[PDB]
Design a protein around this nucleic acid. Structure first.
Ligand SMILES: CC(=O)O[C@@H]1[C@@H](O)[C@H](O[C@H]2[C@H](OC(=O)[C@H]3CC[C@@H]4[C@H](C3)O[C@@]3(C[C@H](OC(=O)/C=C/c5ccccc5)[C@H](C)CO3)[C@]43CO3)O[C@H](C)[C@@H](O)[C@@H]2OC(C)=O)O[C@H](C)[C@H]1O
Ligand SMILES: C=C1[C@@H](O)[C@]2(O)OC[C@]34[C@H]2[C@@]2(C)[C@H](O)C(=O)C[C@@H](C)[C@@H]2C[C@H]3OC(=O)C[C@@H]14
Ligand SMILES: [Mg+2]
Ligand SMILES: [Mg+2]
Ligand SMILES: [Mg+2]
Ligand SMILES: [Mg+2]
Ligand SMILES: [Mg+2]
Ligand SMILES: [Mg+2]
Ligand SMILES: [Mg+2]
Ligand SMILES: [Mg+2]
Ligand SMILES: [Mg+2]
Ligand SMILES: [Mg+2]
Ligand SMILES: [Mg+2]
Ligand SMILES: [Mg+2]
Ligand SMILES: [Mg+2]
Ligand SMILES: [Mg+2]
Ligand SMILES: [Mg+2]
Ligand SMILES: [Mg+2]
Ligand SMILES: [Mg+2]
Ligand SMILES: [Mg+2]
Ligand SMILES: [Mg+2]
Ligand SMILES: [Mg+2]
Ligand SMILES: [Mg+2]
Ligand SMILES: [Mg+2]
Ligand SMILES: [Mg+2]
Ligand SMILES: [Mg+2]
Ligand SMILES: [Mg+2]
Ligand SMILES: [Mg+2]
Ligand SMILES: [Mg+2]
Ligand SMILES: [Mg+2]
Ligand SMILES: [Mg+2]
Ligand SMILES: [Mg+2]
Ligand SMILES: [Mg+2]
Ligand SMILES: [Mg+2]
Ligand SMILES: [Mg+2]
Ligand SMILES: [Mg+2]
Ligand SMILES: [Mg+2]
Ligand SMILES: [Mg+2]
Ligand SMILES: [Mg+2]
Ligand SMILES: [Mg+2]
Ligand SMILES: [Mg+2]
Ligand SMILES: [Mg+2]
Ligand SMILES: [Mg+2]
Ligand SMILES: [Mg+2]
Ligand SMILES: [Mg+2]
Ligand SMILES: [Mg+2]
Ligand SMILES: [Mg+2]
Ligand SMILES: [Mg+2]
Ligand SMILES: [Mg+2]
Ligand SMILES: [Mg+2]
Ligand SMILES: [Mg+2]
Ligand SMILES: [Mg+2]
Ligand SMILES: [Mg+2]
Ligand SMILES: [Mg+2]
Ligand SMILES: [Mg+2]
Ligand SMILES: [Mg+2]
Ligand SMILES: [Mg+2]
Ligand SMILES: [Mg+2]
Ligand SMILES: [Mg+2]
Ligand SMILES: [Mg+2]
Ligand SMILES: [Mg+2]
Ligand SMILES: [Mg+2]
Ligand SMILES: [Mg+2]
Ligand SMILES: [Mg+2]
Ligand SMILES: [Mg+2]
Ligand SMILES: [Mg+2]
Ligand SMILES: [Mg+2]
Ligand SMILES: [Mg+2]
Ligand SMILES: [Mg+2]
Ligand SMILES: [Mg+2]
Ligand SMILES: [Mg+2]
Ligand SMILES: [Mg+2]
Ligand SMILES: [Mg+2]
Ligand SMILES: [Mg+2]
Ligand SMILES: [Mg+2]
Ligand SMILES: [Mg+2]
Ligand SMILES: [Mg+2]
Ligand SMILES: [Mg+2]
Ligand SMILES: [Mg+2]
Ligand SMILES: [Mg+2]
Ligand SMILES: [Mg+2]
Ligand SMILES: [Mg+2]
Ligand SMILES: [Mg+2]
Ligand SMILES: [Mg+2]
Ligand SMILES: [Mg+2]
Ligand SMILES: [Mg+2]
Ligand SMILES: [Mg+2]
Ligand SMILES: [Mg+2]
Ligand SMILES: [Mg+2]
Ligand SMILES: [Mg+2]
Ligand SMILES: [Mg+2]
Ligand SMILES: [Mg+2]
Ligand SMILES: [Mg+2]
Ligand SMILES: [Mg+2]
Ligand SMILES: [Mg+2]
Ligand SMILES: [Mg+2]
Ligand SMILES: [Mg+2]
Ligand SMILES: [Mg+2]
Ligand SMILES: [Mg+2]
Ligand SMILES: [Mg+2]
Ligand SMILES: [Mg+2]
Ligand SMILES: [Mg+2]
Ligand SMILES: [Mg+2]
Ligand SMILES: [Mg+2]
Ligand SMILES: [Mg+2]
Ligand SMILES: [Mg+2]
Ligand SMILES: [Mg+2]
Ligand SMILES: [Mg+2]
Ligand SMILES: [Mg+2]
Ligand SMILES: [Mg+2]
Ligand SMILES: [Mg+2]
Ligand SMILES: [Mg+2]
Ligand SMILES: [Mg+2]
Ligand SMILES: [Mg+2]
Ligand SMILES: [Mg+2]
Ligand SMILES: [Mg+2]
Ligand SMILES: [Mg+2]
Ligand SMILES: [Mg+2]
Ligand SMILES: [Mg+2]
Ligand SMILES: [Mg+2]
Ligand SMILES: [Mg+2]
Ligand SMILES: [Mg+2]
Ligand SMILES: [Mg+2]
Ligand SMILES: [Mg+2]
Ligand SMILES: [Mg+2]
Ligand SMILES: [Mg+2]
Ligand SMILES: [Mg+2]
Ligand SMILES: [Mg+2]
Ligand SMILES: [Mg+2]
Ligand SMILES: [Mg+2]
Ligand SMILES: [Mg+2]
Ligand SMILES: [Mg+2]
Ligand SMILES: [Mg+2]
Ligand SMILES: [Mg+2]
Ligand SMILES: [Mg+2]
Ligand SMILES: [Mg+2]
Ligand SMILES: [Mg+2]
Ligand SMILES: [Zn+2]
Lengths: 159, 144, 100, 103, 62, 185
RNA sequence: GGUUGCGGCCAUAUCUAGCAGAAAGCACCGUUCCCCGUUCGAUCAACCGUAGUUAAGCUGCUAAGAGCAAUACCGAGUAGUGUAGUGGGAGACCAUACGCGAAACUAUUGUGCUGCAAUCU
RNA sequence: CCUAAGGGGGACUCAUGGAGAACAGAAAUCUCCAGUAGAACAAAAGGGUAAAAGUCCCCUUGAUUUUGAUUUUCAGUGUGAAUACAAACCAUGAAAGUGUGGCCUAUCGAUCCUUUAGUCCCUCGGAAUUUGAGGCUAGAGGUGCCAGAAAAGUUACCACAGGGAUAACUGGCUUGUGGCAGUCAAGCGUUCAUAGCGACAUUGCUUUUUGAUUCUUCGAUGUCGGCUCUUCCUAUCAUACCGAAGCAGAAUUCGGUAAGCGUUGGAUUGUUCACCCACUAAUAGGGAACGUGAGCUGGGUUUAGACCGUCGUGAGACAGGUUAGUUU
RNA sequence: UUGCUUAAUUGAACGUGGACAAUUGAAUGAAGAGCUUUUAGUGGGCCAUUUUUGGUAAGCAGAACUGGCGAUGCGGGAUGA
RNA sequence: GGCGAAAGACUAAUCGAACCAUCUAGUAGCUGGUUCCUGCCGAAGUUUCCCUCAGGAUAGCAGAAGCUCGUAUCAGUUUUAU
RNA sequence: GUCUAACGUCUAUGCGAGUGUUUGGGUGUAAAACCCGUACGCGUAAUGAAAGUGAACGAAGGUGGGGGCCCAUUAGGGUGCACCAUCGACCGAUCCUGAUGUGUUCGGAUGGAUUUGAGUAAGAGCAUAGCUGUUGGGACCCGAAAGAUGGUGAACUAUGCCUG
């Protein structure tokens, strides 16, 4: 007999963290979600109402609706050869703000600050990010660091 | 396969210039079992561009037989000559991207003298794939 | 048997329909023969008209109230009003309808 | 299953529009009329020759039935219907549970 | 008889000939499923906003 | 061998000529093939493409559509260009004086344009008084109003028109169109 | 800085065993008419702040303490793994190449920080 | 399965251990301390839960109404189940709140017909009244083959379309099983592991067993056995030359090179197999489409006739017994 | 701006007006991107590496990802999907 | 239907239901076949439902017709952040 | 792999809020060609089971794009058809409210509602033809074992009788 229920295979996914069972810290209920916010989804096993399906555990999406105890999040799911827009109603216990916003929103500010400062100095500044480049030339001092010669060691048994 | 397509290497013995960073290095690492690459000298770049240098003009492969073609396509990037293009390639310049994408992928012949006994193993293990570095010049000398 | 997004059809061809196919190849021939019959009728009774005088009557139903058309015969009251007996009227090219 | 003979639920009657007191009764299917059109069509179809002209169900699988509660408003006499889940046993206004008693 | 039961072989090949396409983004998402109470009031706010802008432009024309 | 990143030997997918064998439409293509090739005016390149379009891709333009376009601010004396047939509208209360160039005019359309002091010219006459389409305004008819489009993309909860021959209470209204008959889609 | 009330993060805060704690606070503490709750004014309810005490709570310190937390020329570039070969081996399995890369172990360090309001030798 | 085992609120803290108290003991009840859950939560398991979701108490019916949106299975159809709101009406609590059945993940059902409830609304078509009938919305009656026909057997008298998409031979992979052979050497062998054996283990070979599988053949490769005849293998029964012995001789046993050469006559049985009698140097084991039916034979198996036993109401069945049955 | 929300002049959503100009905010590629209608055949599969289940195993049976054969010739593996 | 000292045997070489003509070109998810050239593109044996398992419908893969536009904003890839 | 009835998509053509002469009538050099018109079909209104009701708040709506066009002068501004995404308005069904009034049980003004329709929102259709696809027909060609209706056989043979 095959089994394919709603929470099948979620034995470990929906577990609480080790030594983290029990009551919910109240910053979870004090966070404020607005339409357009990017949120990570992680089901809390101790709250069974407004719980996401196992597909959405670990997914990140956009808030589109705010209700009494829940937010509506838009997820794009692959169905065959295209994406389908999914609208999931989730209580805020299974939701956390996505930390990817705060890095990009700070880089926007830093670019704006750098641009005005170069503009203030009447010079130019380059704001595009760069991948790591190969390192330049350099000189290695040997005072206290004369090269030590190594050799491969013979085989030994230590049991 | 996608990585080789994005490098414009869609046939055997096709050559391309890549500016070494992290993104492109991880790209070449993915394509490593299928390519031979290395560090080209100035004479190798000159010979490649002179004999097999072609430009992408209106999505067509046009021989670089006159400096007017290069000027008409790269003058907004301060490239006015075949030597300007070679210089921009060799000492990796601010417009390496535009100059290398304007350059059609080099279509080289097979080596005069052959490969090693078995190609599809790393250059370190006696094969041909991976980084051979200054020996890319000998390989290009064999194939161009 | 059912396939694609197509309208559902009602093609009533499950009986031995091919034994009862009437093709009017003779449409022009009947037209011509009808004209010849019509000429014969006129020449038979000339100069008496080939058409009896017909009345004008309202069409029945709420859909054809507005229209008015040719009836079958003049009523006995109508012929009485012009002083013609129905037996005599039928012999002088007047149509009679005892029913209307 | 034990269900009390009274209940305070919403009354859909136009007069009430509120929770009122109701009398709980088990719903009983009415007698089949001889002049229902389907019952009229079936009798005509079976007549004459041809045998049994409609299907007779045999392959019973359910072992229970859905109990329906008839809720009659004590104020306006409007009836309401509530289906329950499938139960084998069922009493109306039975003896309430006594917790703490001995064997 | 006994046949093949199930296989996902060649299914990613078929999905990537013409699909694997991200959905298009639009400036205005559909408000289907948005809270009815907010949606009811948001209707009145937009209509009033249009009137104020309409009057402001009607001032700046004649 | 090549690892092809795109499909090989693919036609553009656009008409490069009319499907019609009407010689007089071809003469019009003759004229605007020359104009689009030589004027750098974007108007002439649009007209050449529009002369290739099929009948459903050049929907009729009612004389009412032209009236609303002429009612745009600063468009009252523009030349209306319709690559197709201009039809009459007996629901109009009034029509202005206008110059309109079209492939064809209906009897009512030609009457109405000339009755109100306007001109009804052909598209070759346009090319002499406006060889670059200066001070023109191209009008296209409604494409999604066609009856065939009612049934396009039909499915559950799609709200499109079923492909059906008869309409009535006995024709596709019971099961799947009604919650009292199972479900509704 | 201490203390109380309300907290955030939720053991660097817990656990065990000792010792210490000025001021205020807190606390134990005294009583049963009243509201209230009990087998029992023990809990809960109420009254006095009056008769007493830092003994306990609480707080701080101590411990080659347990636990927890953090760090690393610790173990270890080990186990595992992505990729490769017309590599080895009868096989089991193994080596090599381009990459990614643990856990245990060992050693060291630390043992609540902090927000709002009120108050105090 | 549950009027609570649903809902709300409050108080308390479970399994278990230690130390104590008349009868009282391993188990009765009482007390304190410890007690991260080691219990309990209807049920199978998993997750979840500690001033609770557990135990007890109080009040209740939210297990209610109108319908939309959404998640899973998904074609993004149905059904089932669930989620967040909107508009009502309530329960509970001081309140904030919570409650739209069961802590969550399973616990279920279309068209046609019937029945009940609702609206007391539309129609019965020449116009009305009252019965009756038909409509609209929501339940129920059920399809468990659970997207949902109304359904007993036999054919050895048999038919058709096909299938090597599939069984009954050979052949092919495998080698569990069968058979055969090794290594280690605790023991046996009067002493003495290895003259001759050899346990517990372990490595192999073989395709003369039986399985496993279903690749070939179902527009057919004639599916038992014997007779006849040829050839091949060696894991050698006899015969040649030899080595070893717990070889005195005689006899016997183990082994090497060895398939050159032979390996029988009969009673019973259709037999392959078996078992007896007898001769012999020996009466070894096998293969060649389980060699060999346009070579035979036809005793067996496996058409149709018939008898019996058991089974079946019966037609009939038996891989049970019996007899007769075209070999081109 | 609102009939929603707040004790509120608080917010929520949608806005008017103003500022930030091509290094407009990573790489690489792009025979360009997007869209619609309609219809064929198919719905017996099999194999190789790696992961992997039942089985003593199987040229056995069954899954995961990819690449192939099927549908495919050419050089090599004598011969061979 | 006949006839049968009974074999499902005989009923004109036909018998577990004769022969002849017609309904009838009966139906077949099954086997077989299916007729000229070149050019371009080019699959599937997978999803769901079905007395469904040799078959269909459905989605997918493919062709054809194109349409709106012309670097707009896409990708079986990498980097950085999360 | 055909022909036919009825159809889907696409394309060409004629006319166009209409369209279709061919049932028929006129005419003829006689199955042709040419001419005529009433009806009717489809379209021009939908929705509801039905009784019934029946499409402009606005420049026939707002917002972001949008080819082309206008003004410019890199850039920028205006206008922006088709079409795309989104928020609205109108009509029908459903539910709520229920004015003046009245055959006192009818009427249904007015204002609303996470509801619903194959609608309106300056018509787009009708007709002919062609390929491709669908269904009914013998239905790509050939193929059952069967079923039915109406007839012909006891010259073989089975059995009875009669006569040898
Ligand atoms: C005596 C007996 O037991 O046999 C009855 C038979 O008599 C009965 O015939 C009824 C007959 O059956 C029908 O016409 C079918 C109509 C619908 C079908 C079926 C019966 O009902 C179903 C099946 C299923 O439920 C039932 O089956 C209902 C049985 C029933 C019994 C009596 C009266 C009405 C219904 C769905 C829930 C509803 O719809 C339906 C789709 O299968 O209808 C007449 C009205 C009745 O008189 C008649 O009953 C009598 C007295 O004889 O039908 C049943 C299936 C049989 O079990
Ligand atoms: C005349 C024939 C051929 O058809 C046949 O070919 O050769 C002999 C046959 C057939 C088989 C060998 C058939 O193949 C098969 O595979 C399985 C078995 C057991 C059959 C055995 C035997 O049985 C028959 O009944 C018909 C005989
Ligand atoms: Mg089981
Ligand atoms: Mg399972
Ligand atoms: Mg986890
Ligand atoms: Mg619940
Ligand atoms: Mg959910
Ligand atoms: Mg700059
Ligand atoms: Mg490049
Ligand atoms: Mg040479
Ligand atoms: Mg060499
Ligand atoms: Mg060399
Ligand atoms: Mg070589
Ligand atoms: Mg070699
Ligand atoms: Mg060369
Ligand atoms: Mg009620
Ligand atoms: Mg009824
Ligand atoms: Mg009778
Ligand atoms: Mg009858
Ligand atoms: Mg009958
Ligand atoms: Mg099968
Ligand atoms: Mg299959
Ligand atoms: Mg080529
Ligand atoms: Mg329309
Ligand atoms: Mg419209
Ligand atoms: Mg300090
Ligand atoms: Mg003190
Ligand atoms: Mg006290
Ligand atoms: Mg107290
Ligand atoms: Mg103290
Ligand atoms: Mg103290
Ligand atoms: Mg420590
Ligand atoms: Mg410690
Ligand atoms: Mg490795
Ligand atoms: Mg080799
Ligand atoms: Mg490595
Ligand atoms: Mg409970
Ligand atoms: Mg309760
Ligand atoms: Mg409770
Ligand atoms: Mg409680
Ligand atoms: Mg219920
Ligand atoms: Mg299902
Ligand atoms: Mg669905
Ligand atoms: Mg779906
Ligand atoms: Mg559903
Ligand atoms: Mg569903
Ligand atoms: Mg509520
Ligand atoms: Mg009446
Ligand atoms: Mg039902
Ligand atoms: Mg039902
Ligand atoms: Mg079924
Ligand atoms: Mg059955
Ligand atoms: Mg028999
Ligand atoms: Mg039998
Ligand atoms: Mg086979
Ligand atoms: Mg073996
Ligand atoms: Mg064995
Ligand atoms: Mg075998
Ligand atoms: Mg076989
Ligand atoms: Mg066979
Ligand atoms: Mg043959
Ligand atoms: Mg033979
Ligand atoms: Mg045989
Ligand atoms: Mg031997
Ligand atoms: Mg011999
Ligand atoms: Mg003998
Ligand atoms: Mg014998
Ligand atoms: Mg025997
Ligand atoms: Mg035997
Ligand atoms: Mg054979
Ligand atoms: Mg053999
Ligand atoms: Mg054998
Ligand atoms: Mg044989
Ligand atoms: Mg033979
Ligand atoms: Mg023979
Ligand atoms: Mg034989
Ligand atoms: Mg012979
Ligand atoms: Mg025989
Ligand atoms: Mg015999
Ligand atoms: Mg027999
Ligand atoms: Mg018997
Ligand atoms: Mg037996
Ligand atoms: Mg027998
Ligand atoms: Mg006997
Ligand atoms: Mg005999
Ligand atoms: Mg013969
Ligand atoms: Mg602005
Ligand atoms: Mg970067
Ligand atoms: Mg399609
Ligand atoms: Mg198709
Ligand atoms: Mg398709
Ligand atoms: Mg298809
Ligand atoms: Mg098909
Ligand atoms: Mg197969
Ligand atoms: Mg098939
Ligand atoms: Mg390998
Ligand atoms: Mg490999
Ligand atoms: Mg397999
Ligand atoms: Mg197989
Ligand atoms: Mg491969
Ligand atoms: Mg094939
Ligand atoms: Mg190939
Ligand atoms: Mg070859
Ligand atoms: Mg080869
Ligand atoms: Mg070989
Ligand atoms: Mg008879
Ligand atoms: Mg008779
Ligand atoms: Mg018999
Ligand atoms: Mg005869
Ligand atoms: Mg004969
Ligand atoms: Mg005979
Ligand atoms: Mg079949
Ligand atoms: Mg191709
Ligand atoms: Mg087949
Ligand atoms: Mg299909
Ligand atoms: Mg697929
Ligand atoms: Mg784009
Ligand atoms: Mg990161
Ligand atoms: Mg008309
Ligand atoms: Mg004519
Ligand atoms: Mg004639
Ligand atoms: Mg109507
Ligand atoms: Mg209605
Ligand atoms: Mg009044
Ligand atoms: Mg009044
Ligand atoms: Mg009144
Ligand atoms: Mg009035
Ligand atoms: Mg609508
Ligand atoms: Mg319209
Ligand atoms: Mg045929
Ligand atoms: Mg056909
Ligand atoms: Mg046909
Ligand atoms: Mg036939
Ligand atoms: Mg029959
Ligand atoms: Mg006779
Ligand atoms: Mg006879
Ligand atoms: Mg005689
Ligand atoms: Zn009531």
């Amino acid at each position: 007999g095959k089994s394919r229920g709603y929470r099948s295979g979620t034995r470990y996914a929906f577990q609480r963290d080790f030594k983290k069972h029990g009551a919910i810290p109240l910053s979870t209920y004090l966070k404020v979600y607005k339409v357009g916010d990017i949120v990570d989804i992680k089901a809390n096993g101790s709250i069974q109402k407004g719980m996401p399906h196992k597909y959405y555990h670990g997914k990140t999406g956009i808030v589109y609706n705010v209700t009494k105890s829940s937010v509506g999040v838009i997820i794009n799911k692959v169905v065959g050869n295209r994406y389908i827009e999914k609208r999931v109603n989730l209580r805020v216990e299974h939701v956390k703000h996505s930390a990817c916003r705060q890095e990009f929103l700070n880089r926007v500010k830093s670019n704006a600050a750098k641009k005005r400062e170069a503009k203030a100095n009447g010079e130019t500044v380059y704001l595009k990010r760069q991948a790591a480049k190969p390192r330049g030339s350099r000189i290695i001092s040997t005072e206290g660091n004369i090269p030590q010669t190594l050799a491969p060691v013979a085989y030994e048994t230590f049991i | 396969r996608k990585v080789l397509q994005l490098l414009r290497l869609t046939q055997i013995n096709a050559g391309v210039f890549v500016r070494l960073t992290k993104a492109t290095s991880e790209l070449i690492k993915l394509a490593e079992p299928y390519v031979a690459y290395g560090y080209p000298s100035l004479s190798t770049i000159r010979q490649l561009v002179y004999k097999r240098g072609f430009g992408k003009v209106n999505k067509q492969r046009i021989a670089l037989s006159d400096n007017a073609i290069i000027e008409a396509n790269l003058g907004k990037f301060n490239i006015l000559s075949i030597e300007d293009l070679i210089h921009e390639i060799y000492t990796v310049g601010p417009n390496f991207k535009q100059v290398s994408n304007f350059l059609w992928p080099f279509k080289l012949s097979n080596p005069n003298g052959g490969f090693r006994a078995r190609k599809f193993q790393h250059f370190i293990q006696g094969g041909d794939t991976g980084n051979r570095e200054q020996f890319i010049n000998a390989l290009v000398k064999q194939m161009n | 048997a059912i396939s694609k997004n197509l309208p559902l059809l009602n093609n009533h061809f499950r009986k031995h329909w091919q034994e009862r196919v009437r093709v009017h190849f003779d449409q022009a021939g009947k037209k011509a023969s009808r004209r010849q019959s019509r000429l014969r009728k006129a020449a038979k009774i000339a100069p008496r008209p080939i058409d009896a005088l017909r009345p004008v009557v309202r069409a029945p139903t709420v859909k054809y109230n507005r229209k008015v058309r040719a009836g079958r015969g003049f009523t006995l009251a109508e012929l009485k009003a012009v002083g013609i007996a129905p037996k005599y009227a039928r012999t002088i090219g007047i149509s009679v309808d005892h029913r209307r | 299953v034990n269900v009390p003979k009274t209940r305070k639920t919403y009354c859909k009657g136009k007069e009430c529009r509120k929770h009122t007191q109701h009398k709980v009764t088990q719903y009983k299917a009415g007698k089949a009329s001889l002049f229902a059109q389907g019952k009229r069509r079936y009798d005509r179809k079976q007549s004459g020759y041809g045998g049994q002209t409609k299907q007779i169900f045999h392959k019973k699988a359910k072992t229970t039935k859905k109990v329906v509660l008839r809720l009659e408003c004590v104020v306006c006499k409007t009836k309401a219907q509530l289906p329950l889940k499938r139960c084998k046993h069922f009493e109306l206004g039975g003896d309430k549970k006594q917790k703490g008693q001995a064997l | 008889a006994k046949s093949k039961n199930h296989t996902a072989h060649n299914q990613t090949r078929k999905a990537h000939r013409n699909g694997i396409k991200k959905p298009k983004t639009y400036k205005y998402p559909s408000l289907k499923g948005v809270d009815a109470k907010f949606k009811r009031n948001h209707r009145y706010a937009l209509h009033g906003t249009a009137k104020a802008l309409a009057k402001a432009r009607a001032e700046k024309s004649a | 061998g090549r690892d092809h990143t795109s499909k090989q030997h693919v036609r553009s997918g656009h008409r490069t000529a009319p499907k019609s064998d009407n010689v007089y439409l071809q003469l019009l293509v003759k004229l605007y093939s020359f104009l689009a090739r030589r004027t750098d005016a974007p108007f002439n390149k649009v007209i050449l493409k529009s002369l290739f379009l099929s009948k459903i891709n050049r929907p009729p333009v009612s004389v009412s559509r032209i009236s609303r376009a002429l009612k745009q601010k600063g468009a009252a004396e523009k030349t209306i260009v319709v690559v197709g047939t201009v039809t009459d509208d007996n629901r109009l209360l009034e029509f202005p004086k206008a110059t309109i160039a079209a492939l064809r005019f209906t009897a009512g359309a030609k009457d109405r344009i000339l009755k109100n002091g306007g001109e009804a010219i052909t598209l070759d006459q346009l090319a002499l008084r406006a060889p670059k389409g200066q001070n023109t305004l191209i009008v296209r008819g409604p494409r999604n109003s066609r009856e065939a489009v009612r049934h396009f993309g039909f499915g559950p909860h799609k709200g499109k028109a079923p492909r059906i021959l008869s309409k009535g209470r006995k024709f596709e209204r019971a099961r799947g169109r009604r919650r009292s008959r199972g479900f509704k889609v």
